RNA sequence: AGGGGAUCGAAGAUGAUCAGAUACCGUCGUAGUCUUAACCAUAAACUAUGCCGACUAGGGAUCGGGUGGUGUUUUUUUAAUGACCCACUCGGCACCUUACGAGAAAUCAAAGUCUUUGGGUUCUGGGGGGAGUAUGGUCGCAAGGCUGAAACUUAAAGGAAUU
């Protein structure tokens, strides 16, 4: 089991509900997201912080579970992640992918446009449906960030959060950086924070 | 139908991702220039690849587009400038009273209780 | 209306293994489905099943494997000379190296390879495979 | 052969007919439920009311508009130019 | 399976799904499989231990694999309190 | 379910449903109303003889322009009037 | 060499890779054609026939042909491919060039006592293109194959030597008839036997183990 | 083929073999 | 999900769907004490009356008929059994 | 067979257009369109999908009822009623995204749980014409309805989508 150093601290959950990510999606709930938390009024929903966290380490665990960091690649055809998936290529290999996600990566065995992964992940399983469906045809597992309306099909991994705030997607793509280099050695100091903070990864208008 | 076709196109932002800071805003010279680039066989040719360079060069000036790249819309220079915008976001601002007033959060999560108001509405 | 509670019950579990289940709730526990899920345990197709009672009829929840294919009964009640159960697996059994087709004689409900080493036949319910 | 409904009616009951108004098409419309295309078109139209307001005994007041309730346009307005005739996109609405 | 004397038989002895426990297709594009590290109380995770869990196509097709895979890991112990059977 | 019944004491039902069912045959029909013994010229018979009266020249169908040169042949037990064609050529001689 | 621009092309050629049981273990996709034919160079080739297809336009008549074909060795492995093109001299090329991608391995099974080598299938298959479908039966030693020329040559080339064959529909369609067969000698392998009741260890595939090959 | 008109000369048919029919009995 | 606890479910979730579709067959009504004021006269009112009940006393009607539960009158002290 | 008979209006009388128009187009116009007592027992009478019972991916809106939340309102803020909010339930008419499954496809939460064939039951059809025709019965004032062939002829009729 876990050697009881991935619990809820509160230097990662000071900022984990500072960005209001608790909140889930409107009254519309999906069995596959049973994280409701006593629903507030207005219609949105909460979701409980405990489960966001214990899967967000084992989605880590997964990265970092592949042999070659180059295989992993994220998809992100939203414009606020787009920035994200080009900075998180840099800490590891991350082989990313911005703005409209091409046709046929994994196939087409002659494009230019070639993907060879293991490891895919999608910010938005709504805008980006075509890598996850396409990534069924080339055995390849995905990881998902799945609100509690989104469309969850066809997703082995789902890391409960809000896909619709600005500061959120940022933020947990900032925490699985930092637990991926953690549990991969690069990140010696356990206990001890990482340098660069969470809104590096914020696009902006110009 | 003056209108440009791909064969001009081709060989122009061909140029400007290699060859950028060669030429200038300026024609004549444009079309001197590209007897020192790669040979192009057609002299009626080269009076439409130094008139379309510029075109490109006039849009560039007022603001830098997609599909090019001469190392400057790869000037990576902090991300945007903004690289670590810290000025401490993760505290000041409001955490100097303690920010997250809000309503039924981590108040009533019972894995751990942490610090800040907890009575809003 | 409620004619065959067999075939409600076997027909509920048919659905559950095609999508996926990992139980199944059962009504309305007669003692000829109880029968019918008992001898699956001894030949290890269903696993465990819980009888909750009420003073009705009582509920069944079938906790399931997978390991089970497919499950039916064979409508009506239909006569089984000792000549005729070698022919009934020839007919509905993919195999006679797999699955059971049982019927019951006047000893209880039993399996056909059972009931061929009793010597005697009787009357048949269905197949489980 | 498309049109699943064909129109609206999923129950029963038949409604009633009423007459087709002004459209040298006139006939049984299959139930109340058609296209309606109702109008709100003024009694005057623009243009030419500085004439009007001027020529008001008494100041402001006035300016309504022709509140006329239509089922004119059924299964032939693509004479009239009323109901475009669409493809596989008809999902849209009803 | 095997016949009387030995002589091992039936080649391309296939892998069972570890959700619903059925078998998979060969040229089954939709199941995937699914590696799991495991840090022993060192802050990084060791190479060389994956616990292979097979997920189906079938469980990959309903859209169930993402409230699956917290199931079995919680039955290994690597989770405590994402999964809850009781309803 | 199914449409049929499938009663242990139905027996008769769908017994009686299937005699309806098998009239409706090319074969059962004309086997017991004997239209091939009524209506046919031949009484149920591979061959029989008869006396031609005089020939035919029918023509033929689309696409072919052809006439095959039938005859006319009455019967004995029968007696109707009844068209033989001739299978070979030269033949129409010999069955003038 | 033929530079492999895929994972699996560098694989089998390193030599890793000495067999196609694996692959078809873990299900990873193949989109390259030699590994089959390298890995199996003893496999028999035979058309079945050509069916004229044409496209109309505004003029003229614009006429390809249909060609179908089986691949497989006689132990075990067959596949099929189904294609058209402009001439018949590229369509039989043109079919065994996708057919070899298709190859799946067939269920063996026994029909009595499970004495000798394998002979029939382990269980009744079925298999539904379009509104043709085909019950295949497990049938007795020496009791041949019972079915007709346009899919027999399916079962002799399949590795199996005899299967009792029951079909539904008009079999007129040899594509379709061609198609529900392997549909069938697919899906035979997903039944479930008590066999294979007992647990795997569920390997890890070779990817993973040899990734140390990649492009860079 | 229009089903009604030739229906309607089936039923006209009929008429006129009423009719004869009628004319001995 | 496949896997949920119909053998133990959540009391909440028991509580809330209807009583034909839930574990075990167990009514949602219930009974009360009322005492119209003065006399004591202890008796017994079921929620869903479907009557005017009223005490041995005199007209002292407590609840009125109605389509669910039984509108009790403004002076009543009910107390949940 | 009576009452009524305003509009529309099978027939019909006229004026067009048309080579021809007792058709489309304009105006009149009987029966009829309304009701009474008694017949007629028919339709694309269609959801072209029988009835009863059970299970199966979700969501939202809606009709009727009910439950809980000091819910927001209505006064004599407040007692109540009723209008609505939130959460849910039963019975429905039904929708939206997908297809585990079926279907030849159009498509279907059933047209799924059918070769891995069997929950109970009723009715209908075995190529297209002839023909819903002949005759025989039966009901009806009539018009017509129910049951219902044969002789003879053909290798094509018919269904979904493609260029």
Request: aromatic share 6%.
């Given at each position: 089991?876990?050697?009881?150093?991935?619990?809820?601290?509160?230097?990662?959950?000071?900022?984990?509900?500072?960005?209001?990510?608790?909140?889930?999606?409107?009254?519309?709930?999906v069995?596959?997201?049973?994280?409701?938390?006593?629903?507030?009024?207005?219609?949105?929903?909460?979701?409980?912080?405990?489960?966001?966290?214990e899967?967000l380490?084992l989605?880590a665990?997964?990265?970092?579970?592949?042999?070659?960091?180059e295989?992993?690649?994220?998809?992100?055809?939203?414009?606020?992640?787009?920035?994200?998936?080009?900075?998180?290529?840099?800490?590891?290999?991350?082989?990313?992918?911005?703005?409209?996600?091409?046709?046929?990566?994994?196939?087409?065995?002659?494009?230019?446009?070639?993907?060879?992964?293991?490891?895919?992940?999608?910010?938005?399983?709504?805008?980006?449906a075509?890598?996850?469906?396409?990534?069924?045809?080339?055995?390849?597992?995905?990881?998902?960030?799945?609100?509690?309306?989104?469309?969850?099909?066809?997703?082995?991994?789902?890391?409960?959060?809000?896909?619709?705030?600005?500061?959120?997607?940022?933020?947990?793509?900032?925490?699985?950086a930092?637990?991926?280099?953690?549990?991969?050695?690069?990140?010696?100091?356990?206990?001890?924070?990482?340098?660069?903070?969470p809104?590096?990864?914020?696009?902006?208008?110009? | 139908?003056?209108?440009?076709?791909?064969?001009?196109?081709?060989?122009?932002?061909?140029?400007?991702?290699?060859?950028?800071?060669?030429?200038?805003?300026?024609?004549?010279?444009?079309?001197?220039?590209?007897?020192?680039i790669?040979?192009i066989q057609?002299?009626?040719?080269?009076?439409?690849?130094?008139?379309?360079?510029?075109?490109?060069?006039?849009?560039?000036?007022?603001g830098?587009?997609?599909?090019?790249?001469?190392?400057?819309?790869?000037?990576?220079?902090?991300?945007?400038?903004?690289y670590?915008?810290?000025?401490?976001?993760?505290?000041?601002?409001?955490?100097?009273?303690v920010?997250?007033?809000?309503?039924?959060?981590?108040?009533?999560?019972?894995?751990?209780?942490?610090?800040?108001?907890?009575?809003?509405? | 209306?409620?004619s065959?509670?067999?075939?409600?019950?076997?027909?509920?579990?048919?659905?559950?293994?095609?999508?996926?289940?990992?139980?199944?709730?059962?009504?309305?526990?007669?003692?000829?489905?109880?029968?019918?899920?008992?001898?699956?345990?001894?030949?290890?197709?269903?696993?465990?099943?819980?009888?909750?009672?009420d003073?009705?009829?009582?509920?069944?929840?079938?906790?399931?494997n997978?390991?089970?294919?497919?499950?039916?009964?064979?409508?009506?009640?239909?006569?089984?000379?000792?000549?005729?159960?070698?022919?009934?697996?020839?007919?509905?059994?993919?195999?006679?190296?797999?699955?059971?087709?049982?019927?019951?004689?006047?000893?209880?409900?039993?399996?056909?390879?059972?009931?061929?080493?009793?010597?005697v036949?009787?009357?048949?319910l269905?197949?489980?495979? | 052969?498309?049109?699943?409904a064909?129109?609206?009616?999923?129950?029963?009951?038949?409604?009633?007919?009423?007459?087709?108004?002004?459209?040298?098409?006139?006939?049984?419309?299959?139930?109340?439920?058609?296209?309606?295309?109702?109008?709100?078109?003024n009694?005057?139209?623009?243009?030419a009311?500085?004439?009007?307001?001027?020529a008001?005994?008494?100041?402001?007041?006035?300016?309504?508009?022709?509140?006329?309730?239509?089922?004119?346009?059924?299964?032939?307005?693509?004479?009239?130019?009323?109901?475009?005739?669409?493809?596989?996109?008809?999902?849209?609405?009803? | 399976?095997?016949?009387?004397?030995?002589?091992?038989?039936?080649?391309?002895?296939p892998?069972?799904?570890?959700?619903?426990?059925?078998?998979?297709?060969?040229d089954?594009?939709?199941?995937?499989?699914?590696?799991?590290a495991?840090?022993?109380?060192?802050?990084?995770?060791?190479?060389?231990?994956?616990?292979?869990?097979?997920?189906?196509?079938?469980?990959?097709?309903?859209?169930?694999s993402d409230?699956?895979?917290?199931?079995?890991?919680?039955?290994?112990?690597?989770?405590?309190?994402?999964?809850?059977?009781?309803? | 379910?199914?449409?049929?019944?499938?009663?242990?004491?139905?027996?008769?039902?769908?017994?009686?449903?299937?005699?309806?069912?098998?009239?409706?045959?090319?074969?059962?029909?004309?086997?017991?109303?004997?239209?091939?013994?009524?209506?046919?010229?031949?009484?149920?018979?591979?061959?029989?003889?008869?006396?031609?009266?005089?020939?035919?020249?029918?023509?033929?169908?689309?696409?072919?322009?052809?006439?095959?040169?039938?005859?006319?042949?009455?019967l004995?037990?029968?007696?109707?009037?009844?068209?033989?064609f001739?299978?070979?050529?030269?033949?129409?001689?010999?069955?003038? | 060499?033929?530079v492999?621009?895929?994972?699996?092309?560098?694989?089998?050629?390193?030599?890793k890779?000495?067999?196609i049981?694996?692959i078809?273990?873990?299900?990873?996709?193949?989109?390259?054609?030699?590994?089959?034919?390298?890995?199996?160079?003893?496999?028999?080739?035979?058309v079945?026939?050509?069916?004229?297809?044409?496209?109309?336009?505004?003029?003229?008549?614009?006429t390809?042909?249909?060609?179908?074909?089986v691949?497989?060795?006689?132990?075990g492995?067959?596949?099929?491919?189904?294609?058209?093109a402009?001439?018949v001299?590229g369509?039989?090329?043109?079919?065994?060039?996708?057919?070899?991608?298709?190859?799946?391995?067939?269920?063996?099974?026994?029909?009595?006592?499970?004495?000798?080598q394998?002979?029939?299938?382990?269980?009744?298959?079925?298999?539904?293109?379009?509104?043709?479908?085909?019950?295949?039966?497990?049938?007795?030693?020496?009791?041949?194959?019972?079915?007709?020329?346009?899919?027999?040559?399916?079962?002799?080339?399949?590795?199996?030597?005899?299967?009792?064959t029951?079909?539904?529909?008009?079999?007129?369609?040899?594509?379709?008839?061609?198609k529900?067969?392997?549909?069938?000698?697919?899906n035979?392998?997903?039944?479930?036997?008590?066999?294979?009741?007992?647990?795997?260890?569920?390997?890890?595939?070779?990817?993973?183990?040899?990734?140390?090959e990649?492009?860079? | 083929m229009?089903?009604?008109?030739?229906?309607?000369?089936?039923?006209?048919?009929?008429?006129?073999?009423?009719?004869?029919?009628?004319?001995?009995? | 999900?496949?896997?949920?606890?119909?053998?133990?479910?959540?009391?909440?979730?028991?509580?809330?769907?209807?009583?034909?579709?839930?574990?075990?067959?167990?009514?949602?009504?219930?009974?009360?004490?009322?005492?119209?004021?003065?006399?004591?006269?202890?008796?017994?009112?079921?929620?869903?009356?479907?009557?005017?009940?009223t005490?041995?006393?005199?007209?002292?009607?407590?609840?009125?008929?109605?389509?669910?539960?039984?509108?009790?009158?403004?002076?009543?002290?009910?107390?949940r059994?």
């Amino acid at each position: 089991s876990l050697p009881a150093t991935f619990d809820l601290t509160p230097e990662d959950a000071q900022l984990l509900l500072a960005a209001n990510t608790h909140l889930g999606a409107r009254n519309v709930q999906v069995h596959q997201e049973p994280y409701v938390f006593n629903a507030r009024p207005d219609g949105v929903h909460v979701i409980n912080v405990g489960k966001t966290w214990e899967k967000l380490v084992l989605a880590a665990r997964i990265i970092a579970a592949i042999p070659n960091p180059e295989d992993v690649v994220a998809i992100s055809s939203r414009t606020f992640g787009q920035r994200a998936v080009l900075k998180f290529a840099a800490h590891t290999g991350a082989t990313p992918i911005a703005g409209r996600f091409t046709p046929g990566s994994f196939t087409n065995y002659i494009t230019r446009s070639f993907k060879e992964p293991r490891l895919v992940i999608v910010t938005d399983p709504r805008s980006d449906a075509q890598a996850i469906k396409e990534a069924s045809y080339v055995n390849i597992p995905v990881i998902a960030l799945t609100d509690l309306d989104s469309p969850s099909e066809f997703v082995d991994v789902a890391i409960p959060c809000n896909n619709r705030g600005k500061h959120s997607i940022g933020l947990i793509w900032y925490l699985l950086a930092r637990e991926v280099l953690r549990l991969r050695g690069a990140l010696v100091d356990r206990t001890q924070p990482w340098s660069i903070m969470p809104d590096l990864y914020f696009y902006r208008d110009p | 139908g003056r209108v440009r076709t791909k064969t001009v196109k081709r060989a122009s932002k061909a140029l400007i991702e290699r060859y950028y800071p060669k030429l200038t805003l300026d024609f004549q010279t444009n079309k001197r220039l590209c007897d020192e680039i790669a040979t192009i066989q057609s002299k009626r040719l080269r009076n439409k690849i130094a008139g379309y360079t510029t075109h490109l060069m006039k849009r560039i000036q007022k603001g830098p587009v997609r599909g090019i790249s001469f190392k400057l819309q790869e000037e990576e220079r902090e991300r945007k400038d903004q690289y670590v915008p810290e000025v401490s976001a993760l505290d000041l601002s409001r955490s100097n009273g303690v920010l997250n007033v809000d309503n039924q959060t981590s108040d009533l999560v019972k894995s751990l209780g942490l610090k800040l108001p907890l009575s809003v509405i | 209306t409620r004619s065959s509670v067999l075939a409600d019950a076997l027909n509920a579990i048919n659905n559950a293994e095609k999508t996926g289940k990992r139980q199944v709730l059962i009504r309305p526990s007669s003692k000829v489905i109880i029968k019918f899920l008992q001898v699956m345990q001894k030949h290890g197709y269903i696993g465990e099943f819980e009888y909750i009672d009420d003073h009705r009829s009582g509920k069944i929840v079938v906790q399931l494997n997978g390991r089970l294919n497919k499950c039916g009964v064979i409508s009506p009640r239909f006569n089984v000379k000792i000549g005729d159960i070698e022919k009934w697996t020839a007919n509905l059994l993919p195999a006679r190296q797999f699955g059971y087709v049982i019927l019951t004689t006047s000893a209880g409900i039993m399996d056909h390879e059972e009931a061929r080493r009793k010597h005697v036949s009787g009357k048949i319910l269905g197949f489980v495979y | 052969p498309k049109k699943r409904a064909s129109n609206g009616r999923n129950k029963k009951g038949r409604g009633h007919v009423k007459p087709v108004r002004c459209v040298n098409c006139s006939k049984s419309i299959p139930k109340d439920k058609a296209i309606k295309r109702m109008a709100i078109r003024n009694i005057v139209e623009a243009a030419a009311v500085r004439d009007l307001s001027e020529a008001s005994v008494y100041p402001e007041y006035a300016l309504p508009k022709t509140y006329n309730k239509l089922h004119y346009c059924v299964s032939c307005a693509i004479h009239a130019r009323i109901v475009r005739v669409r493809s596989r996109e008809d999902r849209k609405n009803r | 399976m095997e016949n009387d004397k030995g002589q091992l038989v039936e080649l391309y002895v296939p892998r069972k799904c570890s959700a619903t426990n059925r078998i998979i297709k060969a040229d089954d594009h939709a199941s995937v499989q699914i590696n799991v590290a495991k840090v022993d109380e060192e802050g990084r995770a060791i190479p060389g231990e994956y616990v292979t869990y097979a997920l189906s196509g079938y469980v990959r097709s309903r859209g169930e694999s993402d409230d699956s895979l917290n199931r079995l890991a919680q039955n290994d112990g690597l989770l405590k309190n994402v999964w809850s059977y009781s309803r | 379910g199914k449409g049929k019944p499938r009663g242990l004491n139905s027996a008769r039902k769908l017994r009686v449903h299937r005699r309806n069912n098998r009239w409706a045959e090319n074969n059962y029909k004309k086997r017991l109303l004997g239209t091939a013994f009524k209506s046919s010229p031949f009484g149920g018979s591979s061959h029989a003889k008869g006396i031609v009266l005089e020939k035919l020249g029918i023509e033929s169908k689309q696409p072919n322009s052809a006439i095959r040169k039938c005859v006319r042949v009455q019967l004995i037990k029968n007696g109707k009037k009844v068209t033989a064609f001739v299978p070979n050529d030269g033949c129409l001689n010999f069955v003038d | 060499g033929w530079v492999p621009v895929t994972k699996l092309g560098r694989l089998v050629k390193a030599g890793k890779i000495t067999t196609i049981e694996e692959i078809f273990l873990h299900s990873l996709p193949v989109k390259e054609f030699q590994i089959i034919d390298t890995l199996l160079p003893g496999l028999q080739d035979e058309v079945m026939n050509i069916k004229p297809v044409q496209k109309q336009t505004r003029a003229g008549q614009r006429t390809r042909f249909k060609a179908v074909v089986v691949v497989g060795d006689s132990n075990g492995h067959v596949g099929l491919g189904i294609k058209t093109a402009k001439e018949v001299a590229g369509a039989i090329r043109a079919g065994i060039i996708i057919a070899k991608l298709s190859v799946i391995p067939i269920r063996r099974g026994y029909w009595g006592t499970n004495l000798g080598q394998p002979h029939s299938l382990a269980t009744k298959t079925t298999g539904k293109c379009g509104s043709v479908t085909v019950r295949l039966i497990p049938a007795p030693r020496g009791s041949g194959i019972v079915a007709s020329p346009a899919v027999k040559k399916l079962l002799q080339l399949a590795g199996v030597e005899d299967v009792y064959t029951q079909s539904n529909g008009k079999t007129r369609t040899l594509e379709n008839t061609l198609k529900a067969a392997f549909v069938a000698i697919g899906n035979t392998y997903g039944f479930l036997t008590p066999n294979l009741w007992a647990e795997q260890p569920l390997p890890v595939s070779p990817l993973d183990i040899y990734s140390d090959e990649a492009s860079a | 083929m229009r089903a009604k008109w030739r229906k309607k000369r089936t039923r006209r048919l009929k008429r006129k073999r009423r009719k004869v029919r009628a004319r001995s009995k | 999900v496949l896997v949920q606890d119909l053998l133990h479910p959540t009391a909440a979730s028991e509580a809330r769907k209807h009583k034909l579709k839930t574990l075990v067959q167990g009514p949602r009504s219930y009974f009360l004490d009322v005492k119209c004021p003065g006399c004591l006269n202890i008796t017994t009112v079921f929620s869903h009356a479907q009557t005017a009940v009223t005490c041995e006393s005199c007209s002292t009607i407590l609840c009125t008929p109605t389509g669910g539960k039984a509108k009790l009158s403004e002076g009543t002290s009910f107390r949940r059994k």
